[PDB]
């Protein structure tokens, strides 16, 4: 559930990069034992990568359960991450990316061999994940398939995807918790009954994510905004990239780092006093 800093080179060029729970939970481990089983037998390695993609879709249903949109959206992230794992771009520490490099006949810090392997399997890896989705929900709907298109995340910088995911998940939870804060109190001018419990939860949440964002935005500004993120600002870029569910970052936190007061980010002026009593 937490956004850990278990990333590669986090003291160096990856300072402030946070690792998504979804990615931490993406099981894809190669042991140094099976380094030869996969090298001499190219299609055995394939069946393992395909089934790792399979199991990932099976894991996602266990988490989100009957939330079709919430599972499909994560598939596209996990799919892309497998690409990063394969290509060597991945940022997690014990990702066994070193072992994959040797298996695909590249090794010693190269890219060409393992880059072409991904390029040749992207389609079939995704096709597996589609069969995994079908095994999870029964029948693939005739109008559901538009969501389940072959996704374009593979070439996009990983941190940018990870940050986008953070922001989406942040805005979804922030909105969810701000909704419970209204269905707990409408007027309570002052101590009343249950309202403050939600106020503590919303405030706590904003303050957990405050630190996380400060860490993620530290990396963004240093590297990715400077070269090519369309030179847009941190909250400004996600405002036009991932639809309207990353706008809450700009809509409530752009003008100033007003994270310092979590109650100031409330559009309704009525409920603001019950939490700030």
Residue numbers in the entry: 2350 to 2539, 2547 to 2633
Copy text verbatim from the article accompanying this structure deposition.
The binding of VAR2CSA on the surface of infected erythrocytes to CSPG in the placenta plays a major part in malaria during pregnancy, and an understanding of this interaction will be valuable in the development of therapeutics to target this form of the disease. In this study, we present the structure of the DBL6ɛ domain of VAR2CSA and characterisation of the CSPG-binding sites of the DBL3X and DBL6ɛ domains.
Using a bacterial expression system, we expressed the DBL6ɛ domain of VAR2CSA (residues 2333–2634) from the 3D7 strain of Plasmodium falciparum. The structure was determined using multiple-wavelength dispersion data from a selenomethionine derivative and was refined to 3.0 Å resolution. DBL6ɛ shares a similar basic fold with other DBL domains containing a “boomerang”-shaped α-helical core that aligns to the core of the DBL3X structure with a root-mean-square deviation of 1.6 Å. DBL6ɛ also contains fewer disulfide bonds than other DBL domain structures, lacking three of the bonds that stabilise the first two subdomains of DBL3X. While all other current DBL domain structures contain a disulfide bond linking the second helix of subdomain 2 to the linker that connects subdomains 2 and 3, this is not present in DBL6ɛ, showing that this bond is not essential for the DBL domain fold. Indeed, the features proposed to form the CSPG-binding site of DBL3X, the sulfate-binding loop and the positively charged surface, are absent in DBL6ɛ, agreeing with a recent prediction based on molecular modeling. However, no clear additional density due to ligand could be observed after structure determination.
